[model samples]
Each structure stands twice: as structure tokens, then as C-alpha cells.
Target: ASSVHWFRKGLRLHDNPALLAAVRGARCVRCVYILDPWFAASSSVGINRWRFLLQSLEDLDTSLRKLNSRLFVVRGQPADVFPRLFKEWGVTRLTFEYDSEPFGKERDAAIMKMAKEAGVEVVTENSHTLYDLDRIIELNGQKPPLTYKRFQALISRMELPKKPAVAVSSQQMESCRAEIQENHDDTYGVPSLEELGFPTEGLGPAVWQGGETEALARLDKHLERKAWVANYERPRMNANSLLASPTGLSPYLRFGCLSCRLFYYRLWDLYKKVKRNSTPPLSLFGQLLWREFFYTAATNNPRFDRMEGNPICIQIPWDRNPEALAKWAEGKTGFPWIDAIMTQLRQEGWIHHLARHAVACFLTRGDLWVSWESGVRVFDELLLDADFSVNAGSWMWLSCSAFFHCYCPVGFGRRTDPSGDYIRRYLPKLKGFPSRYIYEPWNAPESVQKAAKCIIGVDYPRPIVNHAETSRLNIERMKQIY
Candidate 1:
């Protein structure tokens, strides 16, 4: 049988279950990556994400060239693109990674129907998650587990995650070579960003350019710092702690440029050998499980992104404050820590996870009382590695809208990190303030403020809202409903 491996999120060549399956038992194969306009026009997507995705595809094509294959790029609705190509290329088999989000599931179902009508043998596999989400729900009496403990309890009974697949075999290359088409043909060549009508100006100097090679290179480097790899645990970082950690290879994993299972096994092997290794809930393995948790939640609840209709989310009458929300998004919130982190996010397209938690808390319920949906859309648009499940879930968690709220952030200064190293690094306006007032510049005397050359009201607006009353105000609001 001839095959067409339809590339979606799984961009890399290794441990790609769908790609592996598509090539197996096939005498010839064609790899296709449809550039769907439905997603391109979405506000949830931005230039940063498009840039990463295209670069990853370009890298995939380069790798495939070495394997005697190429990623065939097509533009238009996937429904129209795939069926037409199946006929034109005489393709008998179709395969793709399972996309668990709401839009993807609907799209995939439509494509499956089309494949059935075309008499194409469709193959599907999921490497993005640790467990079969639907099966997990079915086992849990057709309801999603309500708490992490319950989820952990049930998943503990299930088999551990499967070992990631090895590289594509030699015969797979022979098959792809048999069906090879020239670059000029419609069945060939990867598309450039401009070729797909996306402007190239703002996408460069990218915080992290996309590619499997780059991903693996960074992964190797991080792991090679043996002490950090073997003994690492999630740090208790804050807006004042100097942002002491480094960015992980998160973007690549987001785009499937890095295989999640491959990273897990690599870390797990190190764990067994290390004298002291991190444990779950804060470990690197815990982070992977958290990713799986959000994915499963999205699968179990289609309305995971919204409030009114989402059963799992305790819908609150969250304030619809567009004016205040805009301030938050623009990083002009007046709180030094929040604004600095927000600035870092907008500028770099990434920020530390704990920094994310702080800003998310301030926006919804904690200070401004804005909606989590608003936060979700903002992060989705700006984050280079934005994921529907993870983005939405994190927003809910911080906003106290769902899962668990990690708000009530307090106790920073007295006898501790009053230096506000993180704020000084990101927000230079407050850099001259004495260590005593790095966190509370407004409290500094007029003479001290003038000396620092950053008067509270003149240099930077006084805090938009008095944060001292936030917990009190937020609790009162929650009391009326809950």
C-alpha cells in the first residue's frame, strides 16, 4: 500500500508514531502538511507561533531530504486538500497524530469521514499524551476525574507510558524514495512564510527559532550539566528572585519538534542513576504529567476554555473590565513585579512559569477581577509555545476558576528577598531604588524617591489598585456566589 503521512503537530522525524505507522507495510509514501487558513486567521495564533511552526516544517523537510523524502505543503482547507491529493497521488493509506483539542477533534472527524468515502485506510496514534484520555474517562464511569489525587490514583493502575519508537527504518526510506516528486510539482516542497502570505518582518530575532536539531542540541546541553539534570527540582521563583533559572526546551516540545516520551525516558534513566533525583508534582516528570492532565481535561470537557457552559469550571460573575484588562496585557499595571514579567512576556514571547502564575493571579480575581477567558486569549496570542489545553488550564488555575488556585501570594520582603532582583532586571525605572524599597517604592520618603530619580506617581504611576486589599475584595466577591 502507498501512504500519505499528514503532518500536523508532530513535526520531527523521530518517535513520530503516525509517520512510523504510515510508512510501515507501504511500498511508497508521501508526507503532507496542510496549511489550513482556519487556524491562520485565528486571534489565538500570532506571528510568533506561525514562525516557529514554519521553521520546524522547513527543518523537517531538510531532515526528510536526507531520508529521500520531503514534506509536501498544501494551502487551503484541509478537507479539500487531503481528499484531492489522495486521488491525485493514488494514495491508499492516510495517517496523522491525534489532535485532542475541540477544534481539532471536529476537524479530524470530518477528515475521517472524507477518508472513509475515498476508501483510504486511515491510521491514527497519539504520542502527545501519557494515557488514552477517552479510555480514562470511560474507566472513571464516563466522568473526568475531579481532582489530581483521583486522577493520580486511577492512572497509577494503568500501564506506564510506552517507550518512544526508534528511528524510521531503512525500508521506509526506500518506499518514500519510490514515490518521490520533484520540488516544482504540486506534490512537493515546503512553503516559506511569505509564500503562505505571512509577512517576515516581525518574526525574526525569535526568542527560540524552531527545529528538531536545535531542540535536541539544547536538550543535550541541559542534560549534560549533569548536576542540574540529576538533582534538579522546580524552584520557588518569584518576581523578586532574579528569575534565577533558565528556559527549558519548552517551545520545541510544544511544536512536536522534541519528542515528549524521548525526553521523559532520558530524564528517567538519569533519575535511576542519580543519588538524589526530583520527585513528582515539582519534578520534570511532574511537569510532563501536568501537561498530560490539561490535555485530558480538554478532551473530557469541550467547553474547557469558557465559563458559562463549562461544567468543570465553577463559573463566577467575573468582571468584564476591558479598560483594566488592557492595562494588564500592556504591562502598565503599576505593580513592578507584574509589569516587568508582562513586559518580559511581550518582548521575549516567554517568561518563567512562576512569573506566569503571578501575572495570571493579578488579572483574574486576585487584583483586577478580570475573566480567565481574557487572560487565555492574551497568552494564546503572545506565547510562542501557546497550547490550548495548557494555556487555558493554567489561566483557570491561577484565576481560581478551575483545578486549584495557587493565589494568596504574600510574604516577600521582611527578612527575605526585598532586593527585588527580578523587577530591577526587567523594569529599569525602579533600578535606582534602595534595596529597602525595591518591592515597595511608594513607601520610601520623598527625599529617597527623588534621590532614586523615580518618584512614585511621576516616574511610574502608583499601583492601579491597592493590592493589600485584593485578597479581602476577592474573597468577598467569591462569597456572594460560592
Candidate 2:
């Protein structure tokens, strides 16, 4: 009997239990990857994600070819695509890794229902996260921990499986190839950028190549540098160092080209080797655990995407201003640090996590009347590591909208600019300003403003709303909501 392995976010074969289970039981096994129509239909979906996906698919295919098997690429709804593939291969069993996101849960339910009706055995395993959702919840007794620290403590107590590695044999490759020829054509075409309605080249300097090989190479680079992880707590504050310290792994991790288990294991290895008496690896490891915390939080509380008042933050009315939002999005908000971060996000598909929180707070709280969702949409479009759970959770946390939140309701008045230093680095228009006045160009004396060749409200727009007034309004709004 034949079997089919359905690949979703788990793009690589390394440590993939779902693919392993499928191939182990079948005389002939085929691999299938479906590009869901819903994802492809969004405007926010761009060349960055597509380019990454293409590389990941190519790498997966290359790895499989060594085993004499090739991946089958399909374009359509999974409900239609999976059933059709099962019929084409005469597959007796279908296997896949479980996904915990709201949409993933819904999609999986529908596909499982169809498979059951067709008398196909459906096997699903947890491969996306390090700790199983059920296990984490049971250990903590169904209630998701509200604070990241508490969650980390619980994670520290659990026994996680060691990372597993597997290799393909020459005989397996020959057998896979023989079965491939008999079951399907070898020519599985990749869709072009034009066909997908995106620019074909120079998407954004090709910052880094996308593939399992490239992902591993990046991890190696991180270990070599050691600067980011070694002095992570301190160096992470310098915007430039922060950019390097934070794993450029967002895009790969987002697309499933890399695994969380692998990342956790590597970090653990590094911690044991280098963290003898220095700054605890807990700071860096805490960041990894935050990823786990958000995943489990979303699994337990699925409605987090829509609502802001999650018990701890029971009431806080967010702003709703379109014109202010447009200014923020276009990077013309007149706040140097905020504008600079936004500009970097537009140029590169990634940004420092520090910038992410600072900029997000500046928008949701500083620029009064702008909704958190608006900022969420912009970040969603450009961030390569845009995990729905992390993005939403972090956004709320920055906006002081999350339970056990630390974010203060800062307004335009506080001017939490990372100094003129950050703005000058990214925004050339303000580069001429003295370091002291770079963050606040409006404060630069008339002579200095003229000398710098930056005219407030002319060369660069002035603050649209009064920071003090906006703060007062935001505070009032919060009072009513609470």
C-alpha cells in the first residue's frame, strides 16, 4: 500500500516525525506540499515570502532526491489537493504534523473529516513547537501562565526529548526513484514571480538566501560571532548590535525552513559550553522560551488576535486615526527614531526586536487614535518572521494591552527616542543635525534647522498631533475602558 506525507509549515525532513512515520509504513511513499489559495490571495503576501518558499521547496526536493524520492507541488485548497493526491497515488494513509494556529486548526479539521470519510488513516504529530500544547497545559493544569517568567519556570521543569537526526541511504533513494517514475511524472514545475503577480528580481538586495542549508549556515555564523549571544543582554541595546543579536532567523523560522527544536538544542549546547560564570544564558534562552510561551498562549487563547482586553488588560481603548496611521506607515511621522525604524522595515524584511517594541509603542500610544491592528497589518506585510502569535502578543504587550504587561502608556510627550543616534543612522534627511537635536528636529534652533537644510512642515512634516494633548486623550480613553 502507498502512503502520502502532507507538508505544511514543517518544510524540512530533519527531525520531522510526521514524514518519518509516513515513509516507515508504506511500500511506496510520496511527499506533497500545497500552497493554500487563502494565503496566496492576500496583498500583504509578497515576493519576500514567495522567494523564501521557493528556496525551501527546492532544498526539500534536493534532500529527497538523495533518497530517490521527489516532492509533489500542488496549487489549490488543501481539501481538494490532498484528496486528489490520495486518489492519484492510491494512498492508504495520510500523515502530517499538527499546527496550533486558529486557521491551521480549522483547516486541519476539515481535511481530517474528508480523509475519514474516504477510509484513509490520518496521523498527525506535533512538530512545530518544542513542548506539546497538551503537555504544557497539563503540566500547568489547563490555565496558560500569564507572565513569560512563570511560563519559563514551568518549561524548565519539563523533560524535553533530545534532538533527533536522520539520514537517507542509497538503496532508499533508488527505491524512491523507481516508485516516483511509476506513480507520477518527474517534471514538477515551480511558479514564476510574474505568474504569482510579483516583481521577479531585486526584491530587496537578496539580504540572505533561503533554504535549510542557508538556515544552518546562519546558525553557524551566530555561534562564530558569539558577541550577540555572549553579551546578549548588554549588546542587544545598541541598535546596530541588536540587529545582529536577534536571529535573522525570522523568515526561515516563519516559513518552517528551520525548526524550534533545533534552535533550542543549539542554544542549550552553547549555554553549557560558554556560560560558566558569565551573564547567564537565561537571558538569551529566555527569548527562545518567549517564542514557546506565545505559541502555547495562542493555542489556549485563540481569540487573542481580535481582542485586546485579555483579563490582565481588561480595558484599554486604542486609538483610531487613519491620517495619523498613513503618516506612520509612509515613514513621514516626523519622529526620527520611529520614522527610521519604519524605513528600515520597508527596506529590509527584518528589524531589531528592540525597534519592533519601541516603534510599536510610539504608534499605538504616542500617536493617539491609531488602532493597534493598523500597526499589526503593516508589520505583517513586511516582517519575514511574522508569526501571528508573536506579532499579536508582542504588539499588545508593547501597547500595554497584554495580560501581565510591562509597557507603560507612553505618549508623544515622553519622546522615548533612542537618541538622535538611531534616526541619523537610517534617515539621511536628519543626518546633518547635531546628535543632541537629531531626535527632535523641531527643537533645533532656526539657524541650526536652516543649516541642516531640513525645514519642519516643509522638507519634513511637523508632528501632526500634539503629543501632550494626545497623551491626555489616551489616558482619558483608558479610564473609560477600565
Best TM-score among the predictions, by candidate number:
1
* Per-residue lDDT of model 2, residues 76-124, tens digit only: 7787777777777777888888888766888898988888887888888
Error of 1 at 370 (Å): 0.7
What TM-score number comes out for model 2?
0.85
User: What pairs collide in candidate 2?
Assistant: 67-173, 68-173, 68-177, 319-369, 320-369, 321-369
Show the lowest summed lDDT stretch of 10 residues, model 2. 404-413
Counting clashing residue pairs in each candidate, in order, gives: 0, 6
Candidate 1 TM-score, C-alpha based: 0.87
lDDT of 1 by residue, 260-379 (tens): 888887777666556454443323577777787788778757788998889888878788789889989988777776787788777667776766877888888778888999999889
Top of the candidates by lDDT: 1
